[PDB]
Amino acid sequence: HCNAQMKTGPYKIKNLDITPPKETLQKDVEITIVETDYNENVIIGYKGYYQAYAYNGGSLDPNTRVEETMKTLNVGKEDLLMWSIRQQCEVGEELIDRWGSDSDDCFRDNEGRGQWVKGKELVKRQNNNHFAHHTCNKSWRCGISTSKMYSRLECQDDTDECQVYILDAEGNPINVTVDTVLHRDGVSMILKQKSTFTTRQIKAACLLIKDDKNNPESVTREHCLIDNDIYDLSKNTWNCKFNRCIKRKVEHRVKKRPPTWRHNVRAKYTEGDTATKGDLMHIQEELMYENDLLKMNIELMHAHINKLNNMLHDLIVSVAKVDERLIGNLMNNSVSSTFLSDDTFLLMPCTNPPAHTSNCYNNSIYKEGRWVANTDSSQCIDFSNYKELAIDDDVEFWIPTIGNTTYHDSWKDASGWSFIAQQKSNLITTMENTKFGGVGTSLSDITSMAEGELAAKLTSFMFGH
Amino acid sequence: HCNAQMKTGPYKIKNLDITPPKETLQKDVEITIVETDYNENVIIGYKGYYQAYAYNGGSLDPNTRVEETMKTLNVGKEDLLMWSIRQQCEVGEELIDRWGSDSDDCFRDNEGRGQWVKGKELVKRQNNNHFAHHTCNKSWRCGISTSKMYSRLECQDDTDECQVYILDAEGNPINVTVDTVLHRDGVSMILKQKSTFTTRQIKAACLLIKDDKNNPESVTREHCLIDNDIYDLSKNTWNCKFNRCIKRKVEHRVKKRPPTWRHNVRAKYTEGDTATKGDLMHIQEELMYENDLLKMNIELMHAHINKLNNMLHDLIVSVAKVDERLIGNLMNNSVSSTFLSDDTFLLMPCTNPPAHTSNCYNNSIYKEGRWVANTDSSQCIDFSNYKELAIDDDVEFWIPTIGNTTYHDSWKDASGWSFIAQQKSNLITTMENTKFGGVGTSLSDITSMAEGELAAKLTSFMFGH
Amino acid sequence: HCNAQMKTGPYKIKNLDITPPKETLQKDVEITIVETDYNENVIIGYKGYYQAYAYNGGSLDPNTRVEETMKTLNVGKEDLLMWSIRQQCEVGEELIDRWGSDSDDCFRDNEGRGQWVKGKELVKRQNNNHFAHHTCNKSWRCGISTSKMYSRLECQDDTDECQVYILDAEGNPINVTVDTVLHRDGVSMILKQKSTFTTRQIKAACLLIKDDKNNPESVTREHCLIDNDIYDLSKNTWNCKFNRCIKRKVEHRVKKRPPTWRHNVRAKYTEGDTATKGDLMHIQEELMYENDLLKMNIELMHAHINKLNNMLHDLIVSVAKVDERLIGNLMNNSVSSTFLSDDTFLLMPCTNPPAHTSNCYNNSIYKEGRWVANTDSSQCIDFSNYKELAIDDDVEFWIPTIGNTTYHDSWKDASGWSFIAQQKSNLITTMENTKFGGVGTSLSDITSMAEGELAAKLTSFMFGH
Ligand SMILES: *[C@@H]1O[C@H](CO)[C@@H](O[C@@H]2O[C@H](CO)[C@@H](O[C@@H]3O[C@H](CO)[C@@H](O)[C@H](O)[C@H]3NC(C)=O)[C@H](O)[C@H]2NC(C)=O)[C@H](O)[C@H]1NC(C)=O
Ligand SMILES: *[C@@H]1O[C@H](CO)[C@@H](O[C@@H]2O[C@H](CO)[C@@H](O[C@@H]3O[C@H](CO)[C@@H](O)[C@H](O)[C@H]3NC(C)=O)[C@H](O)[C@H]2NC(C)=O)[C@H](O)[C@H]1NC(C)=O
Ligand SMILES: *[C@@H]1O[C@H](CO)[C@@H](O[C@@H]2O[C@H](CO)[C@@H](O[C@@H]3O[C@H](CO)[C@@H](O)[C@H](O)[C@H]3NC(C)=O)[C@H](O)[C@H]2NC(C)=O)[C@H](O)[C@H]1NC(C)=O
Ligand SMILES: *[C@@H]1O[C@H](CO)[C@@H](O)[C@H](O)[C@H]1NC(C)=O
Ligand SMILES: *[C@@H]1O[C@H](CO)[C@@H](O)[C@H](O)[C@H]1NC(C)=O
Ligand SMILES: *[C@@H]1O[C@H](CO)[C@@H](O)[C@H](O)[C@H]1NC(C)=O
Ligand SMILES: *[C@@H]1O[C@H](CO)[C@@H](O)[C@H](O)[C@H]1NC(C)=O
Ligand SMILES: *[C@@H]1O[C@H](CO)[C@@H](O)[C@H](O)[C@H]1NC(C)=O
Ligand SMILES: *[C@@H]1O[C@H](CO)[C@@H](O)[C@H](O)[C@H]1NC(C)=O
Numbered sequence A, B, C: 001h002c003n004a005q006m007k008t009g010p011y012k013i014k015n016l017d018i019t020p021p022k023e024t025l026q027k028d029v030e031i032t033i034v035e036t037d038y039n040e041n042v043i044i045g046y047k048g049y050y051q052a053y054a055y056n057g058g059s060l061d062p063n064t065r066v067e068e069t070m071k072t073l074n075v076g077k078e079d080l081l082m083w084s085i086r087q088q089c090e091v092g093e094e095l096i097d098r099w100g101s102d103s104d105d106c107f108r109d110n111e112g113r114g115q116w117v118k119g120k121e122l123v124k125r126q127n128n129n130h131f132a133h134h135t136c137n138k139s140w141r142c143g144i145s146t147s148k149m150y151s152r153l154e155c156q157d158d159t160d161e162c163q164v165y166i167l168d169a170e171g172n173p174i175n176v177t178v179d180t181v182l183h184r185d186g187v188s189m190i191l192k193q194k195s196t197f198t199t200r201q202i203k204a205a206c207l208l209i210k211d212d213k214n215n216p217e218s219v220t221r222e223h224c225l226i227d228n229d230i231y232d233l234s235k236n237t238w239n240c241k242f243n244r245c246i247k248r249k250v251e252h253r254v255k256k257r258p259p260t261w262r263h264n265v266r267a268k269y270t271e272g273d274t275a276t277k278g279d280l281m282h283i284q285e286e287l288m289y290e291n292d293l294l295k296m297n298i299e300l301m302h303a304h305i306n307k308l309n310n311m312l313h314d315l316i317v318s319v320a321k322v323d324e325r326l327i328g329n330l331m332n333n334s335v336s337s338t339f340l341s342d343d344t345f346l347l348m349p350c351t352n353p354p355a356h357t358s359n360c361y362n363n364s365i366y367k368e369g370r371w372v373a374n375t376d377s378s379q380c381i382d383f384s385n386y387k388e389l390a391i392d393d394d395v396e397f398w399i400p401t402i403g404n405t406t407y408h409d410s411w412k413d414a415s416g417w418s419f420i421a422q423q424k425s426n427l428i429t430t431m432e433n434t435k436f437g438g439v440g441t442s443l444s445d446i447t448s449m450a451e452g453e454l455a456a457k458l459t460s461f462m463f464g465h
């Protein structure tokens, strides 16, 4: 039980320092790197509306009917351009519960002109109130934005031309270009400046690696260390994935490797002389010194790894207080933990249901990483094939799609700690105003005392008071 | 400020890969490995039901009462085996809102038959709004699972014979009968198909290590690297922890280590001849190339370490928003933090209570890793001796013994984020149903006002009429 | 859905073992280390109480009211010293629900004497159900703790004299008098026993490193590895940070480094003899064995790195359930994730408000690491210059200065998971007492019905009698 105070201070965390090893290899080889730079240069736009024309008066006349139409209008090229620069839809006016006798604005105005909105979702409603006259209802839909769909870089020609492929999810490219109608899936898209990229030259260190480590006089090929990986650059061809391409030209050479020395075989260097024991001792001392340097580097790396391990264990032991399934997850087991103190804790086993294809077990649902009871009959997602992504993969998707499905974004659908953050104030108000305690017992009965007894009191007043 | 849009997608996480170093050592030494086979061969099952029988019989009379029971049942041998074979339960019928006037169905079934499910969770609901009749509700339960058994493997030296021991909770061998039913703590579990092991042969790399490092001509012993540790396999004896044993036979020998070269001393195998400078140059160049390869490996390892460090720092700075004591714990200080932005934050000091043998401080208790005010007198645990374990200690938590059969628990005792997950729906209902706001002031006085004056007015006006 | 039985066990996490590499370097160089000794010599204490006085004096009369006061006191020198010596408190008597008709004991004590505890937390309760007499409640608070002092050590080169400095919040030297009482922010602090330091000699390993990597016959300077860093000790001067200082004496030198061997140049020491191919191949074999040892060390280090990588991925996957923003933050994106199974999940795009110098965004406010709708018109903070710190910066947060003794705080101002931990009991009570369900109707009207219908019942009573 500590104390809060008025003493604070602004701060910002700085990453731990990792000292580099001493005597880094000399970098003497040039490498050509080509990758796509950063630019949005995409537009996505759409627009729709609603219609509802109804009439009555006979209950069997064909004019006595109700109708509704789905009509989505494609958006023009300059229309999209100025929707982008102006961030507004060239949308039409909205007519609500309009008596149709002399106002044909719901029949002569279909293209949609004049109204500029930040974005509008159409609403479906009908009107059939005029028992003898006509009436009409209208709605509208807006959409415009920019996007950054992830793209791959391809440089296959030996003539060194490169051009991006703006591909959609699942890995398929989509034929997209400036000032050409696409108008697919009820959306229209425009991109500016096509796309650009950069080229640069970087020095690196390269060595010749034997193919067969257990075969003397084997085949060797060049390898270079670029950022944190060793690439094979034996052939002077472009080799790349994602959007970053690597190339090593042929004029830049790689130092050769001497073959193993053995007696009864000529030893490359031809200088007839006499070797003395002092030379042997000198060479031996030099090589011992080199081994000493390598050992020092090894020890430095070991110290770094030890520091990281200690930090990670402290992190997990601190976090485990909130998440009680962390220890079991790290142990490939199924247990839950409760802490008696800051370092001591207990354990408690859990079971595992059989394999299943969804997240529903007969009034049980999976949410927030736990299995809880459920009463909503229809909230169940059937599992299908799944994509597979790594952390390093950028794959910025922001995929465009128009949704016209019933499911809504009600506040009750919030993930972990979003619910708490959003409802902290409401929960505080509920606890405070409703002063929890044994005072309010209106819950002990049904609405009978609320309505019928109040009506009885009102009648009592009226006819006796 | 984002919201919920129409865009989603199913995904899965792939662990980051670590590139192995080049020119790995050659494995040409044989090692014997013995370990127990992986088999669950432990069956778990449980079953229960919930019943609520109520009869108000009108209001304002002592006959109004709601009573409910929760029961736990045992599962027989044949039923448990059939469940394990079919991966299903065999459970009764669900009764909801049954009129206790001609439907007393909640009294004619006590075993539970008719329905086969893959798993079910009980939902409890009671109501007695109808006063002219009775009413009752019923629910049910399910469960089936398998788990591995806590065991240990040992092997003798003279006989080369191995056997598996079954361990209890604290880690001692016990007798357990195969293919029998044991009821304890509200569950029924069966052990079958006693454990078995296997043997295999694995190639590995071994070398000789001096005992006294800074003394030439010292004792050397064989060391081998198996998975991530170096073992002293100088002696030909079994040595193993948990359940996996390692042994190197005598006939599998390791190559010798040549002594350090010195002048005025015969240099191992000799070939009378005269050495020249060129041979020395060739040898020197070859050794320089080897050192270059080792340096490249060092650089790659350092790059990997840096990558991991950056990832860990990003992880902690993202996580620290929820856990306010993480930064203090990592700094070995006692402070709490609040965030003004995505990366900036403040700090605030805290105190530390003295040493105590329990987790109670005069109306204060330690729960969920925080010190909070306590009013419950009888909740205090006296600390005892603790046993320390690592993450990879290979321990199990299901044990087929005999014990007390009654089981009981409450929903109020839930660890971190299990309480929130289980009571999310109740929180939503509590917040929404009673509109948080200043309208209902019936709580301003005692519980009498709702019934006393109401009945007084009713009776008074009835006999005044 | 798992279970939660009555089987448990105490435990404590043990750190993962990291084996050191074999055949480490030789430590033979003496290094002088000076640092400040460890001790708290800072005393922190506080005391307060809570009191509530209530007298309804009947119901629905203008003489009913409850008033509560929360007070903070000061601690004298002798009292604080005695508390520090005994490690206990001297707190007042607890009064619970005292009848005020002849017992108004909540006015006879204001200092607080009689009770000695190891730490107490107040709980506040009020009740005025008795309309015929007075009533009052009282509670109490205390605390005692010790902490280290934020300091820094410096030494001079010429005189070899070291002095300890006492630092303020920003990190500047200040005068603090010893053995005196300083009151600020409702707490009393005493500083005693000004700090000291110590000196010792530590062996280490040192080597000479070329200033330029590829320049033969360059300048070499000594470098030594202490714990996890390599320090330049070419000059014999003090150089240090925080409070720990390192010095290498002049007489303790480091051995030399032989230069590169070339032909046509005499090779350091000379022993006239003739070399044979046997000597060359012996040297070659010895050096190859050394390279093999280095390779084994490399492989062990790689295994360690892979183990930590796997552990970290398991940790992040397990924790991502509670923190939905972690995955997006790791990839540098703006998405939130919801999980369908324990490993599969969805992704949900989000936008980001522009960066500013405040935390207010026109009815959108940033709290608990999320952007939520803002209802408080005046709650804004302007960002200032930020300082950056590392985890290992050795910074304290208790500073014995002089300030105002007024303190104030609210229970509604709690950080992440402190609010939940502190209000778990109140949430449970609110859920249980207020039976969440569809019975309540007093919320459907306004506070008028409280008095209107009681007046109507009074009129009915007057009419009937
Ligand atoms: C994490 O992602 C952020 C965006 O989600 C990155 O922030 C952007 O980095 C861009 C670097 O390519 C920069 O945008 C461009 O910056 C250049 C020069 O400053 C200018 O051309 C423009 O400002 C901008 N380009 C365009 C077409 O507008 C910015 O630094 C920044 N953009 C923002 C904030 O809008 C982070 O860099 C990234 N962090 C990483 C990768 O570590
Ligand atoms: C602990 O980690 C394991 C991997 O790190 C998870 O994977 C389990 O491994 C089991 C043995 O390797 C496998 O189960 C069966 O193994 C036999 C042995 O060869 C195979 O013939 C079977 O096909 C295989 N599966 C079945 C259904 O029999 C599985 O790979 C896997 N077991 C599962 C998924 O049940 C373990 O799951 C994990 N333990 C946990 C999470 O409790
Ligand atoms: C994280 O902080 C802990 C406390 O804040 C540290 O634990 C204290 O470490 C001190 C020294 O490392 C020790 O305190 C005193 O040490 C001297 C050494 O000479 C002993 O004689 C004293 O008996 C000992 N105790 C006192 C009261 O003087 C203790 O090991 C310990 N003190 C406690 C627990 O009260 C951790 O070391 C620190 N972790 C780090 C720095 O990695
Ligand atoms: C589980 O729910 C399904 C509906 O999909 C139902 O057919 C089945 O009977 C239920 N199982 C039970 C209640 O055991
Ligand atoms: C287990 O049973 C065996 C009989 O095969 C017996 O020798 C052994 O002592 C028993 N272990 C116990 C009782 O711990
Ligand atoms: C603190 O707890 C002890 C042990 O329960 C009790 O004897 C003492 O009176 C308490 N202190 C109070 C109530 O001030
Ligand atoms: C077994 O433990 C339960 C737990 O409360 C208890 O009710 C029951 O009486 C115990 N059985 C025996 C035989 O003591
Ligand atoms: C502390 O007091 C001494 C003596 O007056 C003074 O020399 C020193 O500068 C003071 N420390 C400060 C001001 O930080
Ligand atoms: C704040 O103002 C901007 C206009 O500059 C607007 O786009 C944004 O939605 C506003 N924030 C709100 C309404 O929460």
Ligand SMILES: *[C@@H]1O[C@H](CO)[C@@H](O)[C@H](O)[C@H]1NC(C)=O
Pocket: C403, C404, C405, C406, C407
């Ligand atoms: C201390 O706070 C009080 C109000 O709580 C204020 O009046 C006074 O000026 C403050 N003193 C200082 C030195 O800030």
